[PDB]
Amino acid sequence: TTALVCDNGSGLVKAGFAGDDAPRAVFPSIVGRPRHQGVMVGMGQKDSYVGDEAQSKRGILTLKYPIEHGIITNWDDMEKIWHHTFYNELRVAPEEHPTLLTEAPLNPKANREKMTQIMFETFNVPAMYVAIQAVLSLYASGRTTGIVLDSGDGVTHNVPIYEGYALPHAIMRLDLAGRDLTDYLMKILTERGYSFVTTAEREIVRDIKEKLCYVALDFENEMATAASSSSLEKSYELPDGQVITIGNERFRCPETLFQPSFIGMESAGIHETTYNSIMKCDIDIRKDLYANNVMSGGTTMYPGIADRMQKEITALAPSTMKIKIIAPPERKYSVWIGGSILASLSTFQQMWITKQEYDEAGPSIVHRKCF
Amino acid sequence: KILTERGYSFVTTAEREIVRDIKEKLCYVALDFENEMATAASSSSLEKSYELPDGQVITIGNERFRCPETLFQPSFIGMESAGIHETTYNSIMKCDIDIRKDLYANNVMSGGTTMYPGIADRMQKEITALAPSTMKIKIIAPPERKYSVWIGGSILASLSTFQQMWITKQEYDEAGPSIVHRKCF
Amino acid sequence: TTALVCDNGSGLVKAGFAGDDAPRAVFPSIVGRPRHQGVMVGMGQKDSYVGDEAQSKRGILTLKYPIEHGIITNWDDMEKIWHHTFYNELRVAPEEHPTLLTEAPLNPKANREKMTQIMFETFNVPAMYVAIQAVLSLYASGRTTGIVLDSGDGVTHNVPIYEGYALPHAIMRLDLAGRDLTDYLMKILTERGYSFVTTAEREIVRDIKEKLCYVALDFENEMATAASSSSLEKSYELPDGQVITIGNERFRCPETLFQPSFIGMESAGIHETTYNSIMKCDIDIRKDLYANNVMSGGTTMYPGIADRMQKEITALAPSTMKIKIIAPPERKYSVWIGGSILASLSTFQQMWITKQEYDEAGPSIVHRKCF
Amino acid sequence: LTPKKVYKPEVQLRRPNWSKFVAEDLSQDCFWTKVKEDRFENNELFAKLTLAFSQKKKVKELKVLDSKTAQNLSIFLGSFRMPYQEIKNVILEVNEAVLTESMIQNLIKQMPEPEQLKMLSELKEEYDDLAESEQFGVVMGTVPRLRPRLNAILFKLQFSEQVENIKPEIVSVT
Amino acid sequence: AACEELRKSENFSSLLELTLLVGNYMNAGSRNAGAFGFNISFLCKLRDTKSADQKMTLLHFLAELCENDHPEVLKFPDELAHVEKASRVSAENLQKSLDQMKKQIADVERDVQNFPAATDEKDKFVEKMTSFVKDAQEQYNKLRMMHSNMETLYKELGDYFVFDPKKLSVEEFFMDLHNFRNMFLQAVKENQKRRETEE
């Protein structure tokens, strides 16, 4: 039987089959509800719109994210996301197809418990697995050793692996990713005059961030360049036809990833997080983590981030070590591609959490069987 | 008020039907008000004649397009409100920002007061001047728009799904004459 | 040299000297223009009337508000407001008196640019400063810590401050205040047969809202009581002599402050805004913020709002917290009173933005110097 | 072609910073090759271009109090703006309508030492010449035995708030 | 229509010589000393060049100089008529739409030829759809000849203005020239107001 990989990220659900190269169904994880009064009777008036339909009719909908910082808050909304991504996107029956899910490290355990219980009682499977995203990213990079910075839409985590042995005391989680960048861009877009308050306008500011934003190599020189001349300014067309023009806010929005104190967080940026995750490891393997800095996630999809990361780690590391940022062009879907490796591996077939094991051991086998 | 400029007096309620017939038959909406006023002031080409039921003949000039200009300019009759094109633009701009591209393509006009044969091009010019230039300004003005509201009632009363939304005698006798607020819009 | 405090609110300009308890010149910010054909020659027929004169002759005037939601749109009309509030009300020369101004948080920066430019070029003061209204309200309360909900005619903002240290990532702005309540009362007065469409009638509906309206402690029990018996109904005399009588619209008008979905806004009420601004803060200051809910602004001048605010915050907070809504009786002018504090402090004298610093650095020092 | 006139003004002038076009980028039939702007040259124009486009007394003598005590008192006195003997009377009368928790808690926190308050009480004859923070310490220094009296003032003003907190908790359990 | 309208040039000659002579004296000793020319879209920023007393601008000083010395340069912005109606872009995807039109008509014309005989009297496919392809190929060749006339007139203006088809953003070219028209009318009216105030 062919398997399913369903990366339930905070922003974008990426679901599809096993053995494929690209994910079949990429759609954002929002649940929309109508907030006005319907006057036309009938017309297929649904009480809820899930996914890209909620992207389409978004001017009359309140959009709720079921996932915040890797932790599923609303569980009926997550059931609606899973029902949509099984029955509408893929059009599959989960009773005859295995499923691998991805999970951030340092997650609360009851999230995994309710994920296992919904996947075994509501959408009950022959088998399923819950894995760590950084192991799948290092699978898709094609190497055995390396440190992975995975930054989705809620969770930025650094996990180092040497020779297939992960070090659990060096795992570093930071709750700063693209949704906080979207909220900070909504905060700083009001400086120029453009106001975005609703949940519908969050998608517009997210589209502005996806199309126009980039990581600056030097923040002070780019701020002096944007203050001096209007060469870095770019224009964008809104859905109502109005045209906006933004300047330094193209690079101030991803600069929260290297300076969290803009949004009031005490913790350091991603480069010192990666450097402290390197320095928490044992002393022999650090050189083998210095040359294999694998990036993944959509938030590392800016076209300035690899050279900035190389500059900051080269500033932090000793000078006699080679810093090599592994940045593949397909790093956005890469965790899914790692699942398409790991579902296809012949040695993984004994590592399924079967239904008989769940019915024997309760919902307690998921802690001792997984990581 | 303005037909007393040329020597024709209409003060009774019987005469309001005659002035309403003059407004229904001869009046039209100018595309540009200043150019049409200069054209009517220059040459006697826009002047038309109407026959009163006693047998007298009246002749009117610029009053064919000064009477429906008050819809696009309420300050003729002393009102602080803006015109119908700016009211339509403000009702579009009060909506959410995602849906406006549909609404600029779907201006729907109804009622007999939009039955003048110059109103759609003037409305398109005013909304096209107000909207940004990347928007397709479409105005749907069917020729049967005088009774179309009634036709929409004949749409709604013949619907199979409208059979559950009636306010019956028993619900009226239960809740008094106050259930029509909670049941309807 | 005696300083000046000029709170340019959205609805009412409050200007006066420093060192004084009560504001000297409180007048609404409207610019009137005649819309009818003047037939009597001579007689001093001005083309514009500013302030209380525009209130006096309002039957033959179109009244324009130059400020909408804290953002000054018409700037020549705002120059007429400032020329009237300096030369006619206060009767002062602006070039020999410093003038602090107030500003809503999360304002567009070009408003501050043009405000600084007109305050340094047209009415060329020796020095000025632009501050935040909620810090002035926490000055006038007498305390140091606390969260301030300032609700004027355009802007309702929540700002938390602990020990003189604000948290700018928890400042929450909502564009729902007394002009939206006046327009909602103009919408719901048409149910009883009374029509109010012009801008002259908006002053009458605003006066009805100021005299008769109040905040219900519970909305549903008050609605059932007003639906049952006509005991809550009150009468009011129009200037033409007609007597109106209103029932539940006394408490349906400020209930939009606790339920914004009456006017089609997606965001939550002011109590949920205060609770989310408290929960956005750090944890160890939160017990100090629950006990110091300071309210200011005229929109918090209803005679039911402190008990409703205490009930809603105590419903939202955990039960072992002492909720204390600080509602002084002089909270309508209290922001100005805080300006009378801050202009009179001895340590504030080094914090003026001078004329020479403006001429050195352009109109760009107001972002770097102010908060 | 010829190069342009390299002017050397005496005074450095404010300028617009455009992106210029050099003579390498000029074409044969461009506008800038046919520019004859030296007919517009005038020394009065350059003269007009050169001409156009070129009490408080706040120190305070602090005889007894230090710098930090005098600063934080006058901040709170500017925050409160009552006359000093009126503050003395409301403390002595215990006027519970006027008195609050945050008024009293700011008073205790910014209160000076009793040795400083006794030293301010020894110089009551020079009351008008003292600072505004030092004027408040004279009037607060009019009551002696500072730390026993102020704690008795503290408990009495807290007693009404303590009774209004403790008593509805007991009734809710009962 | 706009390619047929665009046949005229020059107009602005006199103010650009006056601005460059004044501006080279201001930029002397800087990077921009001895500039042979400057951008026409930079003319909005003449108002940003303020004086020492910040009462008149360089836009106000050039308007006051033209009011005193040469009272014929001030009739320039009334000549600018089609400057406001020159701010748009419509190119590129017309070729991709017509190639999609040519592909889809040939897909229809292939399947009309490959259809079998009509077995029912209600099957009115064959009569009307052959008339559709006769209508569509007539309408596409009207579009293809007009697009070739569009491409020839665009190539004729390429020889006329001696430019290769790369230069675009003409909407930012003429918005600044239209804004300079409104700024110069404001500066003349402010200088006439300042002269009437001093009287």
Ligand SMILES: Nc1ncnc2c1ncn2[C@@H]1O[C@H](COP(=O)(O)OP(=O)(O)O)[C@@H](O)[C@H]1O
């Ligand atoms: N090309 C891009 N440039 C910048 N940011 C991007 C780009 N593509 C995606 N993003 C950001 O990354 C996020 C998607 O990353 P992903 O790992 O797919 O999130 P999730 O899996 O949690 O939905 C989006 O929220 C978006 O804000």
Ligand SMILES: Nc1ncnc2c1ncn2[C@@H]1O[C@H](COP(=O)(O)OP(=O)(O)O)[C@@H](O)[C@H]1O
């Ligand atoms: N007694 C009252 N009850 C309710 N609302 C009031 C009352 N008095 C004034 N208001 C409202 O307060 C507004 C004035 O607030 P203002 O002091 O101008 O705040 P800001 O300066 O922040 O705009 C008016 O628009 C009015 O609607």
Ligand SMILES: [Mg+2]
């Ligand atoms: Mg992910």
Ligand SMILES: [Mg+2]
């Ligand atoms: Mg205010």
